[PDB]
């Protein structure tokens, strides 16, 4: 159960790909900031290396806070599936399974219409200890 997702998934060859990071010794992404062009197919890397033990995950949602705060109160009530947002969540456009400390996963989706987007970490606790960056989606 503990596995990509999110409403713009698409099996479909990347147009583009772009790694991000998790930061070593925090519970932060070391990428605070993506950029990218809309309604284009993308395969999002995330490496999940870190001095921490710790687990981490990449949810892009659609929105900001607001809707960030649904998407990771709906993964915090999925336990068993290591807290990833489930299937069908509501405004969760794509999301890389939760990964253990030395792990790395993926997620390849459709941008979504130009605008500005959290990205975000479920794992709970991690959201609200300031484990979020933003997406800039272009023309
Ligand atoms: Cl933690
Ligand atoms: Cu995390």
Redesign the pocket.
């Known amino acids: 159960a503990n596995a990509p997702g999110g409403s713009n998934v698409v099996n479909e060859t990347p147009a583009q790909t772009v790694e991000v990071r998790?930061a070593p010794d925090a519970?932060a992404f070391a990428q605070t900031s993506l950029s990218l062009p809309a309604n284009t197919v993308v395969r999002l890397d995330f490496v999940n290396q870190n001095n921490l033990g710790?687990?981490?995950?990449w949810v892009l949602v659609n929105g900001g806070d607001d809707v960030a705060a649904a998407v990771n109160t709906a993964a915090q009530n999925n336990a068993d599936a290591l807290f990833v947002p489930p299937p069908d969540t509501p405004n969760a456009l794509a999301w890389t399974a939760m990964l253990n400390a030395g792990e790395s996963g993926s997620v390849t989706f459709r941008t979504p219409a130009p605008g500005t987007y959290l990205y975000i970490?479920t794992?709970p606790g991690?959201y609200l200890a300031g484990?979020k960056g933003t997406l800039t989606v272009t023309p």
């Open positions: 998790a519970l710790v687990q981490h995950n970490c794992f991690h484990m």
